Each structure stands twice: as C-alpha cells, then as structure tokens.
C-alpha cells in the first residue's frame, strides 16, 4: 500500500489518525499509533485491513495501491461521478 | 490482492504459471507452485512482489487490488489508451 495515498485520503476526509483507526475497528488505545505506523511505512496493512480503511475513507480500495498519480485521480474521481458521467466513460472505454 | 485479477491478467498475457513466476524472479524449481499458491489464495504476495508480477504482466499494479469490475476495466484500458485518449479522459475528469 502507498503511504501517501492513505495519508491523502485521510486528510481529505478531515479525520485524525485515531479516529480513522477507531472507525476501522482498532482498539482506541492503539488506534493512532497503528495508523501512524501505516502512514509512516513501518507496517503494511493486509488487504482485508486496507479494505476496511478504504470503506471508512469512502474511496475505492485500489486507490491505496495506485502508484500513477493520473490513474489515482481517475480512481478517486470515478468514485464520485454521477451515473450519467460513469455511463459516458464506460461507453468511451467499450471495445478499446 | 484479488486472485481472479492475477489469473485473468496472466491468461490475457498467454503465459504459464511457471513462466510468470520465473519472469518475476522466482527460482524456476518453485515458480509454478508459488504462482499457483497466489492464484488459489493460499498465500498473498506483498506489495513489492505484486509490483513485480504487474510489471511482467504489463498492467497497472492496482488492477490486482481493484474489486469493482467496471473500475478494473477502466484501469486495464487506461493502461493502453493512446496519449490523445488519455488527455480527453484527464480533461473530462478535471475539476470533477
């Protein structure tokens, strides 16, 4: 998982490390330390934990694993497109 | 990592479990077993190994972590768009 993706998504949500960890199911006594460890690259979450974090942060989980900034932005944006916008992109992509 | 993403990307490349493992730097004696284990969900690769697999398979690594089929397809397709198509999508996404 890319640490800067996790940090960015948390900053965008506007929530603290402790609050993110807590909503992700971590004992609040350890919540902030655990999140800080992930964000500093000391430990990597497993895919199951990353999915929990992504759910709390309201992002597609694969955003956290996307090294390419342009693709990351597309992922983050797709996430919030209305159904007509998604259709247009889906159609544009069809057969390509 | 999603096992079906790994398997699909390997089938699309048209290469065997052994050849994928080998090009990914695994001792050929263990290559196919190791790949089969990943593809059957017995072990999960770490992000560094997933990046190696994705490089061999010529896909954005985050494809392997994308649960949503529509987003997966967008990722796989973006991967192969010409520079003008990418520009159009980038522009469409701007400010959204």
UniProtKB/TrEMBL annotation, chains A, B:
Protein name stated in the entry: Csp231I C protein
SMART domains: HTH_XRE
GO molecular function terms noted in the UniProt entry: DNA binding
Organism of this sequence: Citrobacter sp. RFL231
Domain HTH cro/C1-type residues, every copy: 6-64
SUPFAM superfamilies: lambda repressor-like DNA-binding domains (SSF47413)
């Amino acid at each position: 998982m890319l640490i800067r993706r996790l940090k960015d998504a948390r900053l965008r949500a506007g929530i603290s490390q402790e609050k993110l960890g807590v909503l992700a199911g971590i004992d609040e006594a350890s919540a902030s330390a655990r999140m800080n460890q992930y964000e500093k690259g000391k430990h990597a979450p497993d895919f199951e934990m990353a999915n929990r974090l992504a759910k709390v942060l309201k992002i597609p989980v694969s955003y956290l694993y996307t090294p390419e900034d342009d693709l990351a932005q597309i992922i983050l944006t797709w996430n919030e497109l209305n159904e007509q916008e998604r259709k247009r992109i889906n159609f544009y992509i069809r057969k390509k």
